[PDB]
Amino acid sequence: EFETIERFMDCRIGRKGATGATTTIYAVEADGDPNAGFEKNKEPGEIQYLIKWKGWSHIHNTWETEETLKQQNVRGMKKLDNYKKKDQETKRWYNCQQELTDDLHKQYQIVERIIAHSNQKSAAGYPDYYCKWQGLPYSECSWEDGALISKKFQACIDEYFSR
């Protein structure tokens, strides 16, 4: 099977190769941003798109190029043609609105509450947790790796098991 693009979240000129799994917020937190200190007037850059994937919560969003999208045979490529058209007719044509939008997008990566846990645990003893995301409805809850959730949202785990 293949991945499917749900929504184009953002666009940037970023460091060549700063795409894929190393760009999730949790890979950035563990190993540093692959795009850190990028200055488009000092080194090779490429147009990168921030992708929200179908069936994966916002913590799994990754930066991708049209090349990486085509190489991984992702579905929803019609949205790329659509986003590129929309992006071009914005540059031709706000900063408080883009800032507000960005803060919102950051909230979708925050666990508000844990509402279920798996009976099975990993070898490291972590169950998976069903997460309610800040600023998103319950229809957007998702199962997540307990080891990943414990890194930043231990307080949500503690609240869930305190009940």
Binding site: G20, A21, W143
Partner: peptide
């Protein structure tokens, strides 16, 4: 039923 993004 969780997953992580892996290279």
């Amino acid at each position: 039923t969780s997953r992580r993004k892996r290279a």
